[PDB]
């Protein structure tokens with residue numbers, strides 16, 4: 001015999017913050033020998049980028 | 050493609066001043082030496098080690 005106009009809130013996530021990292025700076029930094037040693041590993045951090 | 054970096058040139062400030070000589074000859078050229086069970090310990094600090 002009666003009706004109620006109810007209101008509800010529904011929350012869904014949309015997206016997260018984009019994060020960009022680099023192999024050379026994060027792993028060791030400015031070491032040239034570290035870069036030379038990492039160059040022999042291949043393109044792992046290129047694939048990560 | 051890559052990252053941007055700034056090249057370095059040269060240092061800024063030195064170590065503590067080094068103008069002495071570490072007496073390494075006290076433990077190297079000694080008149081008498083000690084035994085294995087009771088050796089001698091000499092603390093060497095605040096000097097230049099060669």
Ligand SMILES: *[C@@H]1O[C@H](CO)[C@@H](O[C@@H]2O[C@H](CO)[C@@H](O)[C@H](O)[C@H]2NC(C)=O)[C@H](O)[C@H]1NC(C)=O
Pocket residue numbers: 001002003004
């Ligand atoms: C259906 O329900 C609503 C409330 O959910 C009723 O509205 C109330 O009516 C009384 C008397 O008419 C008022 O004193 C209230 O202030 C009203 N409430 C609101 C929120 O407006 C309504 O009367 C009901 N319908 C029937 C046919 O009984």
Ligand SMILES: *[C@@H]1O[C@H](CO)[C@@H](O)[C@H](O)[C@H]1NC(C)=O
Pocket residue numbers: 066067
């Ligand atoms: C050298 O050492 C002395 C004390 O050992 C210090 O006072 C002084 O600042 C140092 N540097 C120079 C350039 O004299």
Ligand SMILES: *[C@@H]1O[C@H](CO)[C@@H](O)[C@H](O)[C@H]1NC(C)=O
Pocket residue numbers: 074077078
């Ligand atoms: C003897 O002492 C001198 C300085 O006192 C030192 O230069 C030298 O190494 C020591 N040993 C020998 C075998 O000369």
